[PDB]
Design a protein around this ligand. Structure first.
Ligand SMILES: Nc1ncnc2c1ncn2[C@@H]1O[C@H](COP(=O)(O)OP(=O)(O)OP(=O)(O)O)[C@@H](O)[C@H]1O
Ligand SMILES: Nc1ncnc2c1ncn2[C@@H]1O[C@H](COP(=O)(O)OP(=O)(O)O)[C@@H](O)[C@H]1O
Ligand SMILES: Nc1ncnc2c1ncn2[C@@H]1O[C@H](COP(=O)(O)OP(=O)(O)O)[C@@H](O)[C@H]1O
Ligand SMILES: [Mg+2]
Ligand SMILES: [Mg+2]
Ligand SMILES: [Mg+2]
Lengths: 177, 456, 51, 86, 509, 456, 51
């Protein structure tokens, strides 16, 4: 069973609650703080101890987060600890952001080119992708010298490769096959 | 409302629906775009249902939308189904266009109550010597043809259809379950050429089809027979292989998350069989006469599937591989076969005494067979030598060439009557034919022809 | 005999072709690695934006 | 590590975010989590006894046979196909 | 060794390069174990779809779990690694098809392995398909001569039938199926031989024997040897079936041999256990029955209307067929095993080979009592149908009579007549390898036995009598053999013609 | 870069590496503080790899540093390996110093292609009567000696190494896979004293060794044989016990996280066998004649390992415990043993008919065993009595004193030509020796010695 | 025939050795999607020396 299979019940429950009470940004910060806080070398150890009860591990994590956890976020941590799932906190935040982004009709698109491209080109790619996908696009542009020329676009599971490297690879496979 | 395909593993598919909108057990679902139907087997919780696909899964993808139909698989019933060939979902699988349906019934139903059960004992003549002697059938009863691979189950079912279905004036249903696609085509053209097709509803689910189809075709054919029974009619229901319904459950059981039982069968073997077999019955409203062929894995009658089947039948006909291996046909075993109708108070003392007389002679011969092979025949008593000769003659007089077997035998087919059968076996038991050679009784219909074959 | 000669002959053409193809791909990589610069990207990113 | 227990479903976890101690408030009442092959798994019924009878909607009855740490496994004393999650 | 030809061959691939952009669905490799690859991100992958990995390596999607995709590699997997990209091709597994494959040796994906050049086929087809439905089929009423009198007389095979060859190790299962392929070189039936889990030198020896007998030009050889991926061994029977179906769908006849379905079942069991699917009756997957039933139901005879509809009216008034000869191996004669039980329950008949008969010098080793054909006389020519009626059941009764009367004192004329005849037919059914008989040769042999001419012949002389008689009729009666071989017809003129020749033979030779 | 041990369970070790530096499948790794070698079997994800130790794991702990070597286990090959003893990793274990190697080859390779295969049928005489009669060997082919514990496999092989080296002038490679350390010492000194050692390469991984060694020693010996074959030579490859390669795989399978198959075997049983067996073949470059001993667990020839091995061999020699119990050596079973060379087109009609005649007589004698035990020999027919008498003489004439078996009894060894073998059995089948006593055929080499033994 | 193959092989080997440059520049030109001659002939004479 993948961590995504196991964290799905918790992230979906946290998202449905945060959405119903209009607290999406507060829980994004709270879960971001818990996911970050549970990954700390001292907290990760405390959560692994065999002598502590589920309520003790949960209270300890709630006391450390404090201000950043409203009463609902604190009730969630006591539930994650009771079911002995504190190791899943990093995965729980991640699925919560995906439900949030799909709800907010938003898409984060990674982009790579051999060397830097202008704002005029980024805005031309952004309008084309938003017109194709029917979503708000956030281009995380970057460079990779492994490309001989051109650019590669990664809109989640969808990929569009227009690079010279992809064309050299198609020729190498065409000649070997 | 609608759900989405979340997982696909072989023939089993999981679909997620809103928690306020989970489809019911046995509910039918439809995949969007692709031409496939799913049946809910289980509700897994958190809005997910586990289902078996009623078609191949090669085109399916995760994330396809699925529509809840609000009901179980519903098939056309009544007069419009006669003279037509159909699949598990009730679609026509012949080039004759749409079915003239007026009503549809769901394939999942409760069995008739204890107060609705029938009580008839009207004897049915089959025209086959061995069956009419040791396995007498009755109208509105259940018959089972048990046997391994290659011993005659389909051939005996084809002879029984010829000697009962054609002459009968009611409706018939023929269900081909896990049958060879060639046998279904051969049967269809025979019903077509014989002008019998207007009386029969044909439902086919052959071995080329997915596990979900083979797991539900028996319920489709039975749903059509139940509509005719509940109208007050007398109906005939034929099933080429009931073992394939059990097997489809074994093939899918482990992927449905069920731990295996003995001999690797599904834990639900006896309940899945009981839920089906208790619906195949005659009631106070109308009657169903049914003949089922039962496959016996590796010829072992103690295997959990054949062993759980005997208790559901009135007449049990057992076919033996050792008899078939000697060229004797029909290859029926008079000692293991039986019928609830073999009672002097139901038939008569003359018939019963002849049947028990034949069985006594064959049972005694079974212990002498192994003796003669090591120490020889000459060492047996004067009464044993005579009895062994009669047993070998009786064993041959059980044989009869069938009209549906002319392509295998070369000789023509013989129909024999109940009185003719009784008289022939009493003659061999009393010693009226001790002078005839052993080969004269092999493949010869009634007793007269045996006297004639001895002269050739 | 005769068929086996043509079986060997075509295998030699393919063994040579396998080396010629590898060299042609290696050569093409070096040509593109020198002929392409910023004046080419404005003719590739713009091309992709229409596809 | 360990697979999801019967109590680890979003409708149940969402209820504990509101009221931490939502269970044990009605120890005589529970909710159906899953239904399959004549077996029903229920969340709650904290005070059910081994072999006690359980009442479901529609006059259907079951018997408690698996009193696990997170849920109750019950078998139906009749037809199970009419029961559903929730 | 012509230059410039190679340049234009390379230019043909460079000129036709797909230089435009493509929209694709993609994932990343997470783990690589025993030929199984796990991937994240392939949202639109379909079940059984081909996955493209770096360096032209291909896989197939078999587990579509909620959070992961389990894929099996269609070749060597040891070059794959964590973090490599997995791509998606919107195509189901397909293989090349057509008459261009005749006389060639190919892998389970259709690539040539004989070194005789490329296969200029002009048509590909899907490896996994559903067989034609009930209304499109036609009854079996045409013969398929194996060239062996014991098989062609007692266990006949018709065009579109499925006949199982079953026995233990080293008793002639491959010899029976390869001789049946060799006999089709003049029949007009195309052949396919599928080798699953065999060593490459055994495959090369079968191909050398097909070539030595002139049968290779009419045969397609599909190889998935013992060192190849379990996925290729699992797929090979379906690839070969697809190559045979090309002829069936176009109003032509084909024959296919699966040299070991028990090795295909062992390859499928490996993949299924590595995918962690729950095991059954002997560690085999739950759907091992459906593995073979889905393969074997394609072998069939299709009606003229189906061929007319498939070819859009280009072929009319002709039926098409695919005949199958699957092979199964048993352990010490144990037929109760899960795989043999399943396959015996699907075929239209079986040919049982017995080690005790094989050691006793009855070399075709066919047990007539256990072997049976469900199509029977419809699969035989008029002459063999009449001359072989009842021989199978008569031999089954002779084997019992020989054991029952073994130590007993002298019996009646009916018993001596049956015993003396059964001994002669038993010695007659013996045949050598790579020596097939025509309809006329089998007919003379059957006629001399069933019409009583062998009654004066010694058991130890039956082989010499048959060989001499055939040689005699081939010299003094060549026009009669040519008349019997046109369609296997029979009438009082041919019956009297054979009678006169056998009488003249015995009275002078 | 380098990784860290994260888990240790018996012979299997898990190591974690940086995500950009994860080692390849079959790549060799070295532990920093002990220099123990590990072979990568699979990549688990998150930079973690699973490996098998090529030595003892006692004293290893979690957190130790591990170095990736960038290549698979590489061993020395060529002329420098002749007259030397090596371990699984190619290190010298004979105290004679370092190997003067010119190059090293990785132990993992693909089998030669379908186009590289050789069609050889040239007969190889062994000088052993039963083998030369019913199991004729061929140059460049594969032989398997099947047998349970203590039946004759190591003796019957050492007699073949002695007899085949008379005509062969090339090199030999010997791979000791999971057997006795004392027999490796006995064989090394025997060849050293006989001056035969400078033409043999020796590799060992005996029963005392951990699972990783026993699993890869077969590949190390085969890699040396493939170097000599690819140089255009004709070489002999001897494998002490091929079953141990499969068994070492069973001990490790559950630790590799794989689900078990029938009788506890690894699910990869047939693939692990095919990947090794297909490399042991002759090609158009050079030839490999190979002899392999195959152990039969609890005397069961139907066991998955022996059952899967038969298809990989040209000649199969089946040894029996029932035959060895009567006193007959070599204890070969003529009815179970067979060869691809037993064909009229390969060995000629005279040899073929003699071999077929011997098998017919022995088969008929085996059918009478139960009757003879109950009623005695005197009840048989005059024909069966004569056949049983010849069967008893044939069965005794198949015995032969070996030059390696002299220590066990005292009798001198015998070498019998194919001509003398055919002449003896043909005479016994024709009846030319019906008058000589049954004990005259026991342990006598050629047929003329049976005539001299009968004089006493 | 094996002797004829060995004797004819050098005649094609020096011919493909001359064609590698044409195959490399034509391969690069397709991949670039525009004419490359003005940035390829000086590349051919400088890179072909290594093949
Ligand atoms: N008609 C025959 N006459 C004489 N010998 C025969 C005959 N048919 C087969 N044999 C011989 O018997 C052996 C049968 O081998 P074959 O490969 O055909 O059997 P198999 O069952 O397929 O064996 P395997 O299990 O190894 O695949 C061969 O030596 C073959 O030459
Ligand atoms: N009554 C019979 N007359 C002649 N042959 C028979 C008879 N019964 C069985 N057989 C033989 O067995 C086969 C028919 O039995 P079938 O119905 O196909 O068996 P199964 O029980 O496996 O379906 C044919 O090969 C046929 O020759
Ligand atoms: N004539 C003989 N007398 C006694 N033992 C013999 C004789 N010939 C061979 N052997 C037996 O041969 C065996 C050779 O190895 P074997 O036990 O068969 O194989 P393995 O040890 O490899 O499983 C020895 O253990 C020995 O007992
Ligand atoms: Mg049938
Ligand atoms: Mg074979
Ligand atoms: Mg030994």
């Amino acid at each position: 069973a993948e961590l995504t299979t196991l964290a799905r019940p918790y992230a979906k429950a946290a998202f449905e609650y945060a959405q119903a009470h209009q607290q999406l940004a507060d829980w994004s910060a709270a879960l971001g703080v818990l996911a970050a806080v549970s990954q700390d070398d001292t907290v990760r150890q405390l959560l692994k101890e065999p002598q502590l009860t589920s309520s003790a591990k949960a209270q300890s994590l709630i006391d450390v987060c404090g201000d950043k956890l409203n009463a609902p976020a604190q009730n969630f941590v006591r539930t994650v600890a009771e079911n002995k799932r504190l190791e899943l906190l990093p995965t729980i935040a991640e699925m919560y952001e995906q439900l949030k982004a799909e709800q907010e009709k938003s898409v984060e698109v990674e982009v790579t080119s051999a060397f830097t491209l202008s704002k005029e080109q980024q805005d031309k790619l952004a309008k084309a992708l938003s017109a194709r996908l029917s979503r708000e696009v956030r281009l995380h542009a970057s460079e990779d010298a492994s490309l001989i020329g051109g650019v590669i676009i990664r809109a989640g599971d969808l990929v569009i490769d227009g690079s010279v490297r992809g064309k050299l690879a198609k020729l190498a496979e065409a000649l070997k096959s | 409302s609608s759900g989405r395909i979340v997982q696909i593993i072989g023939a089993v598919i999981d679909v997620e629906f809103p928690r306020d909108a989970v489809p019911s057990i046995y509910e039918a679902l439809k995949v969007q775009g692709v031409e496939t139907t799913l049946e809910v087997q289980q509700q897994l919780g958190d809005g997910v249902v586990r289902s078996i696909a009623m078609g191949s899964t090669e085109g399916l993808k995760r994330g396809l939308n699925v529509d809840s139909t609000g009901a179980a698989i519903s098939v056309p019933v009544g007069k419009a189904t006669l003279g037509r060939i159909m699949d598990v979902l009730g679609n026509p699988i012949d080039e004759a266009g749409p079915i003239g349906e007026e009503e549809r019934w769901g394939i999942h139903r409760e069995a008739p109550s204890y107060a609705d059960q029938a009580g008839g004992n009207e004897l049915l003549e089959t025209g086959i010597k061995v069956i009419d002697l040791v396995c007498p059938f009755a109208k509105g009863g259940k018959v089972g043809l048990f046997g391994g691979a290659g011993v005659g189950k389909t051939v005996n079912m084809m002879e029984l259809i010829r000697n009962i279905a054609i002459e009968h004036s009611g409706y018939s249903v023929f269900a081909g379950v896990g049958e060879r696609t060639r046998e279904g085509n051969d049967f269809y053209h025979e019903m077509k050429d014989s002008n019998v097709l207007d009386k029969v509803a044909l439902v086919y689910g052959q071995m080329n089809e997915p596990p979900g189809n083979r797991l539900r075709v028996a319920l489709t054919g039975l749903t059509m027979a139940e509509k005719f029974r509940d109208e007050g009619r007398d109906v005939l229901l034929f099933i080429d292989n009931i073992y394939r319904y059990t097997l489809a459950g074994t093939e899918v059981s482990a992927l449905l998350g069920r731990m295996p039982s003995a001999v690797g069968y599904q834990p639900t073997l006896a309940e899945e069989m009981g839920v089906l077999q208790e619906r195949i019955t005659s009631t106070k409203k109308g009657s169903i006469t049914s003949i089922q062929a039962v496959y016996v894995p590796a010829d072992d009658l103690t295997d959990p599937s054949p062993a759980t089947t005997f208790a559901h039948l009135d007449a049990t006909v057992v076919l033996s591989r050792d008899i078939a291996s000697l060229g004797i046909y029909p290859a029926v075993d008079p000692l293991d076969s039986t019928s609830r109708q073999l009672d002097p108070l139901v038939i008569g003392q003359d018939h019963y005494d002849t049947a028990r007389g034949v069985q006594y002679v064959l049972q005694r011969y079974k212990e002498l067979k192994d003796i003669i092979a090591i120490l020889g025949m000459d060492e047996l008593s004067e009464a044993d030598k005579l009895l062994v000769a009669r047993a070998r003659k009786i064993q041959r007089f059980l044989s009869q060439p069938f009209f549906v077997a002319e392509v295998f035998t070369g000789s023509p087919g013989k129909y024999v009557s109940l009185k003719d059968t009784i008289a022939g076996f009493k003659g061999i038991l009393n010693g009226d034919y001790d002078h005839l050679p052993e080969q004269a009784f092999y493949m010869v219909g009634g007793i007269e022809e045996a006297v004639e074959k001895a002269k050739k | 005999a005769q068929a086996e000669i043509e079986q060997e002959l075509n295998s030699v053409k393919d063994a040579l072709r396998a080396q010629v193809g590898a060299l042609a791909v290696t050569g093409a990589e070096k040509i593109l690695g020198a002929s392409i610069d910023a004046n080419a990207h404005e003719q590739l990113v713009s091309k992709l934006a229409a596809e | 590590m360990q697979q999801l227990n019967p109590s680890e479903i979003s409708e149940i976890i969402k209820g504990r975010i509101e009221k931490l101690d939502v269970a044990s408030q009605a120890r005589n009442e529970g909710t159906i989590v899953s239904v399959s092959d004549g077996i029903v798994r229920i969340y709650g019924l904290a005070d059910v006894m081994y072999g006690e009878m359980i009442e479901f909607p529609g006059g259907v009855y079951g018997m408690a046979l698996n009193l696990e740490q997170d849920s109750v496994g019950a078998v139906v004393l009749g037809e199970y196909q009419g029961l559903a999650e929730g | 060794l012509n230059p410039s030809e190679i340049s234009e061959i390379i230019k043909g691939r460079i000129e036709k390069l797909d230089v435009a952009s493509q929209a694709r669905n993609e994932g990343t490799i997470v783990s690589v174990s025993d030929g199984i690859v796990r991937i994240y991100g392939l949202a639109d992958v379909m079940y059984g779809e081909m996955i493209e990995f770096p360096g032209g390596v291909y896989g197939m999607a078999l587990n579509l779990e909620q959070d992961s995709v389990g894929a099996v590699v269609l070749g060597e997997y040891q070059g794959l690694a964590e973090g490599m990209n997995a791509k998606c091709t919107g195509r189901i597994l397909e293989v090349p098809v057509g008459p261009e494959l005749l006389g060639r040796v190919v892998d389970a994906l259709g690539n040539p392995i004989d070194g005789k050049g490329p296969i200029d086929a002009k048509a590909t087809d899907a490896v996994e398909k559903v067989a034609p439905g009930v209304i499109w089929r036609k009854s079996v009423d045409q013969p398929v001569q194996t060239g062996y009198k014991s098989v062609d007389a007692m266990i006949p095979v018709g065009r579109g039938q499925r006949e199982l060859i079953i026995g233990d190790r080293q008793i002639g299962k491959t010899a029976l199926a390869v001789d049946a392929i060799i006999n089709q070189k003049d029949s007009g039936i195309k052949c396919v031989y599928v080798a699953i889990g065999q060593k490459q030198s055994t495959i090369a020896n079968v191909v050398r024997k097909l070539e030595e007998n002139g049968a290779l030009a009419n045969t397609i050889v599909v190889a998935a040897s013992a060192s190849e991926s379990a996925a290729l061994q699992y797929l090979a029977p379906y690839s070969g079936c697809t190559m045979g179906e090309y002829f069936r769908d176009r109003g032509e006849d084909a024959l296919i041999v699966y040299d070991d379905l028990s090795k295909q079942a062992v390859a499928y069991r490996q993949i299924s256990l590595l995918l962690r699917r729950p095991p059954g009756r002997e560690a085999y997957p739950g759907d091992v029955f459906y593995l073979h039933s889905r393969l074997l139901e394609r072998a069939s005879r299709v009606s003229e209307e189906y061929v007319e509809k498939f070819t859009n009216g280009a072929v009319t008034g002709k039926t098409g067929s695919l005949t199958a000869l699957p092979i199964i191996e048993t352990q010490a004669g144990d037929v109760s095993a899960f795989v043999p039980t399943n396959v015996i329950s699907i075929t239209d008949g079986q040919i049982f080979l017995e080690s005790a008969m094989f050691n006793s010098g009855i070399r075709p080793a066919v047990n007539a009592g256990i072997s049976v054909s469900r199509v029977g006389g419809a699969a035989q020519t008029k002459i063999i149908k009449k001359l072989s009626g009842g021989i199978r059941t008569a031999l089954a009764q002779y084997r019992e009579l020989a054991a029952f009367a073994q130590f007993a004192s002298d019996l009646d004329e009916a018993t001596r007549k049956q015993l003396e005849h059964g001994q002669r037919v038993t010695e007659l059914m013996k045949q050598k390898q790579y020596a097939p008989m025509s309809i006329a040769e089998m007919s003379l042999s059957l006629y001399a036995a069933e019409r009583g001419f062998l009654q004066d012949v010694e058991i130890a002389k039956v082989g010499s009598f048959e060989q001499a008689l055939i040689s005699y009729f081939q010299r003094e009666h060549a026009a009669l053999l040519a008349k019997i071989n046109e369609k296997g017809d029979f009438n009082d003129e041919i019956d009297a013609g054979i009678k006169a020749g056998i009488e003249k033979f015995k009275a002078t030779q």
